Amino acid sequence: RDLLSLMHHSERELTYLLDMARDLKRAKYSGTEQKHLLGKNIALIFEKTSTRTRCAFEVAAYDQGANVTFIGPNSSQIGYKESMKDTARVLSRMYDAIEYRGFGQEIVNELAEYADIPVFNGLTNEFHPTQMLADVMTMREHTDKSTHQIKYAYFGDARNNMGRSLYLMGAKMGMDVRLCAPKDLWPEADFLATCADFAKESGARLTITDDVKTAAKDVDFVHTDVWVSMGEPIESWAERIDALMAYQVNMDLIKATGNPRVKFMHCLPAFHNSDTEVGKKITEKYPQLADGIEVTEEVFESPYNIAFEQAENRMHTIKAVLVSALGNI
Amino acid sequence: RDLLSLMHHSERELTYLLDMARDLKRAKYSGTEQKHLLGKNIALIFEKTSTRTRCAFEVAAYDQGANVTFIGPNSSQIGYKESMKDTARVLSRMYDAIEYRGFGQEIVNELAEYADIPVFNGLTNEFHPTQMLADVMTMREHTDKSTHQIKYAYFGDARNNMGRSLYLMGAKMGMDVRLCAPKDLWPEADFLATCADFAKESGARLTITDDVKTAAKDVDFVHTDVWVSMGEPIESWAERIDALMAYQVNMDLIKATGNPRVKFMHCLPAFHNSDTEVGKKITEKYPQLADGIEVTEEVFESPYNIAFEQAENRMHTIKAVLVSALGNI
Amino acid sequence: RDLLSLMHHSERELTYLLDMARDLKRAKYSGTEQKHLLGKNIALIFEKTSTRTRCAFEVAAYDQGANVTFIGPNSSQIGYKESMKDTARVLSRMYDAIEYRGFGQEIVNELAEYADIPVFNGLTNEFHPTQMLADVMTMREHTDKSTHQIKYAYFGDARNNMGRSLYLMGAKMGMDVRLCAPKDLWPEADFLATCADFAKESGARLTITDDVKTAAKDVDFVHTDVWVSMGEPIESWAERIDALMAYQVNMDLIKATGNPRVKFMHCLPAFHNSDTEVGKKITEKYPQLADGIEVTEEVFESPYNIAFEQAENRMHTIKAVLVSALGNI
């Protein structure tokens, strides 16, 4: 969806944000962080509740000295008696920045050019460029080696936003990335060409297989995302589960890498057990899945797992965007 | 309703708030704004969701250094197990100010005299004195001429709160105001007398016609508010729409003024098109209204429209009240 | 429930918190309060809406310079697609402290030892140790005499958390406390033994009667809590009301003390009249209760009533915990 924003950015532009995030994170850890958004007011306007990326946004903003007004579906009826267009045009005159998550990519653009101020196009939850920056910043941080030397793979539905995004990102940064999925769940091959271009001029190793052991070779990072269809009733998942349970990240797929240093990453949320309400619903129809779907309780509750460090890095990545767009240096 | 608070204020008192709002707005624009509510905590307690006047309040408070606890219907069950009386008496000992919007004008008064602290009687959303101050401050700002010289008219249901309020305000400030409505939708004539008193001693031109071209004469400002009854089902609006569609603000009513400088104002929200969910519902029964009701898409999406500047002025007006009542000078 | 945390604390530990609360309260009143939580971010994660203890927490945090992210049932779907375990482990890397109210005592413990940061086990609403500290701090403040010399009684269902807690607290601090209830609504006598131990070595007068005039003797404080079962339908309360209406706090029970200085305390909320929605429901079945249940409108709207001062003291008690656990001195 919104990875035509991630396509117009150069390796050098993306590297500027990864450096700002790396330094902002270091400043907070060493208590050298100067507030550059002191006295700025920011509206956080969400169509759906999404407490992980809300928090990431609030904490970025508060560390940088800003105030926040969260407006959730709970607290608003935006689009009911008053246009979203009208409400934005009022808030754009009161707030120094506004952040719209949900609502579709179409109207956010409309109320953006009017705006006398920054209007972030789904900077939160969205399989955003910010998600790719967090992931690359996470991998860069853990291997302590040049970005272009980093080896990673995505396992599951290569057609979904994390897969397309992690591949396009690999192609932009000159990294060694492998999409590993069923051959009928591969990106539409014209997309696979736009990535093959960037990769020649940036020198990225692209490699889209359907064989696990191929892709899992000497990778520093194994990635997956939820591949069950939450849109469709649980009753009809059988066919889907059959296609992808090969591509589950289990302890065996970690070992298959024969790199005892390898790390697992996951943008979250992650079906890895039955603690959740939807877990129970799934596992009641599908008792094989008591122990996880795209990834197992074994791997998730193991030291290979750095998804929480990676969720943290969304906060430093969001902050680096907010400071870039409102801090004046 | 709450314009018996707007009646006890003198021209000189109202002018003090309009000056504080004008200067506070200038300070924010030139970055000379000193925080006078530093370390104050304010509770914002709302019966209904109302994101435009909530935001206006939050931003006023944050620019002045204050903290805010928003309590919406979402986040509270005030009046369920615990009296509103009890909850207020606890919060009045923790917060430096409380703001009650909704709940009826009756009880807010009760828990106010107990209060060791300021308790604002519907300072938000309410067709408040603050709404009149914003509107007068908006007109004063755009004509750059003495208040008493300003010419404006309200078109639609002269009996509703904006109409009564814009007339009483005109009478207090010595302005040239015209209410223009059907003769059966005119204020109860004892109210029209209390305004005719103030106008003699302040020198205001009052003038309540039912003829558009009369009222729209050489006015600097054309005002309307929503006149459809949201209380009643859409099926039964026909009679109402027939009575008032004359009084719609369309491009022709702007031209009818023969002042190419004239501005349109609207307290919002405004049915001007079908973007809203209630828009669709109305326009499905009433396809003539695809393009707006009290005012047209033509005027609303035109440079005559300064309703958004006017919504902004509610934030500077709210701030001027908050600073007057809590800042200690 | 969570008074096995209140059992491991010594008289000298509890006295340290009561002193910090007393001094923090004095600092705010005299404007000498230094911010020790400047730049700290705190997550406030609530399963149920609970606006009195939310506010107490927010105000404690803002007076001490902290920021807050409130997450209510309104604004979250914690436990739906994402484990509470997972969400906590992400937020624990962004926030300096987290506060979990509701969710059961079991899992809060789980996600606590992981936590690189303070995780308060139901510091809000919970019949918490913080509730006991507020109550003791309230009584200490009003008698201006040594804690161990203070005389108080609880009237109603001695088996419920306030009763057990006010008794255990009395036993820890060496105070003169009386539980006064029906003999079949007395704590399980093994609990009554653990309290009788502490009381010997601290020198507390314990005394559990069923005779009002005995317990109400020369007490400085009369306490009660709601004893109707909100879990069960109103239709079936008759038997319960019959057992306890003896133990109602009415003007007569105040006089029965023959101390014209005596004060009434109540952790709130308090059924004292029909203003509430649940009031009406109760009083429609039970018209005798128009004027209150555990306590009367006569006492509640009288100067004997200091429940609001006591609710305030939850804010200074919460602050003393927050400053103890995050302020670094």
Author numbering:
A (entry chain A), B (entry chain A), C (entry chain A): 8 to 336
The article reads:
Ornithine carbamoyltransferases (OTCs) are involved in the arginine deiminase (ADI) pathway and in arginine biosynthesis. Two OTCs in a pair are named catalytic OTC (cOTC) and anabolic OTC (aOTC). Structural and biochemical analyses were employed to investigate the CP cooperativity and unidirectional function of two sequentially similar OTCs (32.4% identity) named Ps_cOTC and Ps_aOTC from Psychrobacter sp. PAMC 21119. Here, we determined the Ps_cOTC and Ps_aOTC structures from the psychrophilic bacteria Psychrobacter sp. PAMC 21119 at 2.6 and 2.2 Å and compared them in respect to the substrate preferences for kinetic processes and cooperativity.
The cOTC is responsible for catalyzing the third step of the ADI pathway to catabolize citrulline into carbamoyl phosphate (CP), as well as ornithine, and displays CP cooperativity. As shown for other OTCs, the Ps_cOTC monomer consists of a CP binding domain (residues 1–152) and an ornithine binding domain (residues 153–313). The Ps_cOTC forms a concave and funnel-like active site located at the interface of the two domains. The CP binding site sits on the loop between S1 and H3, where the conserved STRTR motif is clearly defined. However, the generation of symmetry mates using Ps_cOTC monomers from an asymmetric unit revealed a dodecameric organization with four homotrimers arranged in a tetrahedral manner, which is identical to the dodecameric state of Pae cOTC. However, oligomerization with varying salt concentrations using SEC indicated that Ps_cOTC remained a trimer even at 1 M of NaCl; therefore, the dodecameric assembly could be a crystallization artifact. Unlike Ps_aOTC, Ps_cOTC forms a long H10 helix extending towards the solvent area and is stabilized via hydrophobic interactions with H12 and H13. However, the corresponding 80s loop of Ps_cOTC protrudes into the CP binding site. Interestingly, the C-terminal regions of the 80s loops from the Ps_cOTC trimers were gathered to form a tight triangle at the center of the trimer with N81, which was not observed in Ps_aOTC.
